[PDB]
Amino acid sequence: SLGPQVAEGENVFGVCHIFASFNDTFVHVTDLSGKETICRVTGGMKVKADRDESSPYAAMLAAQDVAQRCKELGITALHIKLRATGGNRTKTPGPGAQSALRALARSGMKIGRIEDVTPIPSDSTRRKGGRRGRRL
Amino acid sequence: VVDPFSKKDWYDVKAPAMFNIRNIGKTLVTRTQGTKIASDGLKGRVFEVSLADLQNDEVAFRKFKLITEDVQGKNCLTNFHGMDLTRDKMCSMVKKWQTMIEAHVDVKTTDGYLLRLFCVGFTKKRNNQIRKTSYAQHQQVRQIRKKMMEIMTREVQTNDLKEVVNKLIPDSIGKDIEKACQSIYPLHDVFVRKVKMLKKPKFELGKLMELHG
Amino acid sequence: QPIKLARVTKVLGRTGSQGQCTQVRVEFMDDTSRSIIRNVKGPVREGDVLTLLESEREARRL
Amino acid sequence: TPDIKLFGKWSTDDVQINDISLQDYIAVKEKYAKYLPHSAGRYAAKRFRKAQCPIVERLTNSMMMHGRNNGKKLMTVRIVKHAFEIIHLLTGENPLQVLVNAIINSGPREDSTRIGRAGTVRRQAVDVSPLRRVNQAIWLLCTGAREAAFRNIKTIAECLADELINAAKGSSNSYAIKKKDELERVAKSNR
Amino acid sequence: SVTVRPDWVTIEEMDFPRLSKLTLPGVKEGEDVLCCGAVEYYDKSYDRVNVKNEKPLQRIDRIFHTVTTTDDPVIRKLSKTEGNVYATDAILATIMCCTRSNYSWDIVIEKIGNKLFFDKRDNTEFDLLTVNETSVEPPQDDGNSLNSPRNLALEATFINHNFSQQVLKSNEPRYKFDEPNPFIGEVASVAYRYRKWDLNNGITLIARCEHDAVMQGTQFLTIKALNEWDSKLANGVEWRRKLDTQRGAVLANELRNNACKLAKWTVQALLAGSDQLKFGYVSRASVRDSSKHVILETQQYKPNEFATQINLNMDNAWGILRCIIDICMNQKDGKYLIMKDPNKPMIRLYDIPDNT
Amino acid sequence: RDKLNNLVLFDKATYDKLCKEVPNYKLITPAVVSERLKIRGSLARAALQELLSKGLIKLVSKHRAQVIYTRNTKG
RNA sequence: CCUGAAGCAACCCUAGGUCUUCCCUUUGAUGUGAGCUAAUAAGGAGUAACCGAUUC
């Protein structure tokens, strides 16, 4: 529980992987390596209803618990790696992306550098749903 | 009922002598409990650092991958692994009404390291051009791509890895290709999109500690 | 945060669901040049004063 | 008295509206200096004609409410006269100055409302106009004194004196400041 | 303001964003070491003066002493006794609300030993009052025009020096502190009192603080005069129109147009510890008549209320001041110059020979 | 819940409070005195009319709805 | 008609104590207890419950 960095100026950086699907949100802090995990609070751990796992609210709760949990270990600032589902599926991030990123900045952390890391394929395998799509 | 972060030593990370800001940050490890060792489990971690943070303050769109190939003592020693342009940059460059020319060469340094370099270049629209398009014919494209490969090979092949990174810290290769292809078709947004690492020589320490000052 | 005075310079358009908020261009009495857009309840006139609790946030123009 | 027009027996001059914002929509000084709260009106003729009604008359208008007391301005004028006597006793200030201070301290700065990206809905925070500030300031401390007096020995004149003293202070004891702070809190909670 | 010679060495540069971010808490109370001069009683009966019942603005011959830190005999005495930073209200008002600065201004720092004499250049345009500085467009007129920045500033300065004396019952027994005015019937109503500020980081500050007059109710007055010359072009609303429905609007509009002047005047009063700052609404006869003036109205504001109203931060004012006194109590002796970039928003600091 | 039982006539110690206290108050009204002594408005009025005719409190205004007195001046 | 009462730092006058402290007693402050009020505080929470697509 002791990052031996200087009390005055030294910022200890983590990196927060915000995987935001359209029916879940993840907020997951790691080393600059990306190997050693510190926190992972999902949208679904906080709220107990299936329809609001992908909420701005649930993502706001998740980022708040992550912010509080990582402040104790002594992670001061965070780099950001945002992503939607990707592959064959959507490449627009979920509605929890904005509220989560906002929430762990309202909660007194520092924001380093942000970038999209969605798995964008060269050209991909056949997408789920028939030739005639998802008819409803 | 075991606090899992009680047994965690923090380790300072060090970048090689080629960059201005030496230390990248800190790294977590588990205390040597049993047979598996802290330093051995810590050896071979890939750190993706933006060149803005790696230097003092510059371009933030070029990133360098660095491998902790050895640990001396409370200090991870990273070494040049690879390079990649950011998604935002690559997506911003690729726009409609022009020709995108892509090359890749599999070239080896004087020491063991064998890289794969990917070059990219987009056909520039002239200052008095009224034609919307500004496309390159197929033979003009592959004459450009042949010249891309010829420079990319020459620049790396003849000198060692310390000097090829010193060339990738600016974009001397991309500026050289861009000026070279002015006669065939004027390109503008020319970079070495990506550098990959395929083979390393069998690990040395004296060769690492020359790169670490 | 210190409470700051924004002065209405030109009333632009009416907004809200039931046409209830006047959206107005304000010119800051504090800084010489900074002019932002704010949604305002009640009746507002061209050339009077507002007391903003924050002098950074801005309302979405339509 | 061809020079000064003492409101019953209260001085016009030497009352200052400190706040620059509420200064135009508060009429107490130099031309709105009149002897009685009572007058003809014609302040509902055009849009911002209302701003020129002496604040004492605005208070006298707002006071007469809850059905059984619609259009008893003579009874309301005697309530305001008795309240100004009682304010002067307990405070020792100019009762017009205490009223002006209570108007400033009671008026909210921010309120919550329903806005757009029309499709669904959203309750965001917005500003209140300097007229809306003074309009709601008067209404709040009038209804505060009203509901306080209902089923009580403390007479309407005493309840008004209580509200205007405690609101001019900024107590959070007057219904005016209590409710102001509730609206500004909700306005913050969803901004 | 000044033509900068090739012998003048730039040492330090500070821009307005960096100066805006500064703060200092812990600034202690000002201690009246000396109170000098004699101040008249104010006629509260010039406030039965509105848009309908105005007054003639008359020329009053009373002698104003524009004596700087260099020529101050009490500061010259106090120099050796205690204090290492000596200033006037106009000078520190400039540095404090420097953030709003539009035009080129200058301050001569004179570090003789372990001292800062924040001095002003006599026979330079420092004691002019600027006009419509911070408008959408400042007056873009030529020196031969009557609506020029020079000619508007000239008459604005005159009417302020007129108004301060004219409103005053200036031949009824004066309030005397201890001494007569240290500069000399002929004189003008003004009182100079010196104050010590112990300033956290290890600086003692002795500034000369000026009250304009006394009013009863006793009470001390800082008094200034707001000018309205040709509103329709000037990029402001008319004063004579009604001013009574729109007083708050006529005020806030003339404030933005004179952002730095009203900021210097208000921090001037906060410095002196005046409990009330009054004003004087002066306009022309016809919109292009430089000679005539008529006093429309006056409004009174407690400077503490006014400064939080208009905009100021004591922490900013004292935070910028600690920075500049620290810079020039750090670097070497001789004559300096805090000059603001004529066209851009940044203050510069040159080191100069012993002459200019 | 709660109920109010005021006095129809003075207790000895309540009248001792009234004879000592109510000429110290800045505002003297039958409603104020009614709350401050646990006494019916009828008793309050009758007591304050004693206090006035006695010549101890300075009346400011009388009205069927509102009768206001104050403590008499000092010098 | 009588109610408190024993030493006053030291010299002269003066009144046989012509005298002002134990404390009776009232006004001004500070701290605790209790009431009304803060307040519907805030938080719990825009959570739980209930309703939502679909059939004309």
Curated annotation (Swiss-Prot), chain A:
PROSITE patterns: RIBOSOMAL_S11. GO terms for cellular component: cytoplasm; nucleolus; small ribosomal subunit. Residues 116-136 are annotated as: Disordered. One of its GO terms (biological process) is translation. It is found in: Cytoplasm; Nucleus, Nucleolus. The keyword NAD does not apply. There is a cross-link at residues 46, 48, 91 (Glycyl lysine isopeptide (Lys-Gly) (interchain with G-Cter in SUMO2)). Residues 127-136 have a biased composition (Basic residues). Component of the small ribosomal subunit. Part of the small subunit (SSU) processome, composed of more than 70 proteins and the RNA chaperone small nucleolar RNA (snoRNA) U3. Belongs to the universal ribosomal protein uS11 family. This is Small ribosomal subunit protein uS11. It comes from Oryctolagus cuniculus (Rabbit).
Curated annotation (Swiss-Prot), chain B:
It is found in: Cytoplasm; Nucleus; Nucleus, Nucleolus. Keywords: Acetylation, ADP-ribosylation, Cytoplasm, Differentiation, Isopeptide bond, Nucleus, Phosphoprotein, Ribonucleoprotein, Ribosomal protein, Ubl conjugation. It comes from the Eukaryota. The modification N6-acetyllysine is found at residues 14, 36. The keyword Ubl conjugation applies. GO terms for cellular component: cytosolic small ribosomal subunit; nucleolus. ADP-ribosylated at Tyr-135 by PARP1 in presence of HPF1. The keyword RNA-binding does not apply. GO terms for molecular function: structural constituent of ribosome. One of its GO terms (biological process) is cell differentiation. There is a cross-link at residue 14 (Glycyl lysine isopeptide (Lys-Gly) (interchain with G-Cter in SUMO2)). The modification ADP-ribosyltyrosine is found at residue 135. Component of the small ribosomal subunit. Mature ribosomes consist of a small (40S) and a large (60S) subunit. The 40S subunit contains about 33 different proteins and 1 molecule of RNA (18S). The 60S subunit contains about 49 different proteins and 3 molecules of RNA (28S, 5.8S and 5S). Identified in a IGF2BP1-dependent mRNP granule complex containing untranslated mRNAs. Binds with high affinity to IPO4. Interacts with DDIT3. Part of the small subunit (SSU) processome, composed of more than 70 proteins and the RNA chaperone small nucleolar RNA (snoRNA) U3. Belongs to the eukaryotic ribosomal protein eS1 family. This is Small ribosomal subunit protein eS1. It comes from Oryctolagus cuniculus (Rabbit). The chain holds residues 21 to 233 of 264 of the full protein.
From Swiss-Prot, chain D:
One of its GO terms (molecular function) is RNA binding. GO terms for biological process: translation. It comes from the Eukaryota. The keyword Ribonucleoprotein applies. CDD domains: uS7_Eukaryote. This is Small ribosomal subunit protein uS7. Component of the small ribosomal subunit. Part of the small subunit (SSU) processome, composed of more than 70 proteins and the RNA chaperone small nucleolar RNA (snoRNA) U3. It is found in: Cytoplasm; Nucleus, Nucleolus. The gene is RPS5. There is a cross-link at residue 34 (Glycyl lysine isopeptide (Lys-Gly) (interchain with G-Cter in SUMO2)).
Curated annotation (Swiss-Prot), chain F:
Belongs to the eukaryotic ribosomal protein eS25 family. Keywords: Acetylation, Cytoplasm, Ribonucleoprotein, Ribosomal protein. The modification N6-acetyllysine is found at residues 3, 12, 20, 26, 54. Component of the small ribosomal subunit. The ribosome is a large ribonucleoprotein complex responsible for the synthesis of proteins in the cell. It comes from the Eukaryota. It is found in: Cytoplasm. This is Small ribosomal subunit protein eS25. Component of the small ribosomal subunit. GO terms for molecular function: structural constituent of ribosome. One of its GO terms (biological process) is rRNA processing. The keyword Acetylation applies. It comes from Oryctolagus cuniculus (Rabbit). The keyword Ribonucleoprotein applies. GO terms for cellular component: cytosolic ribosome; cytosolic small ribosomal subunit; nucleolus; postsynaptic density. The gene is RPS25. The modification N6-succinyllysine is found at residues 12, 54.
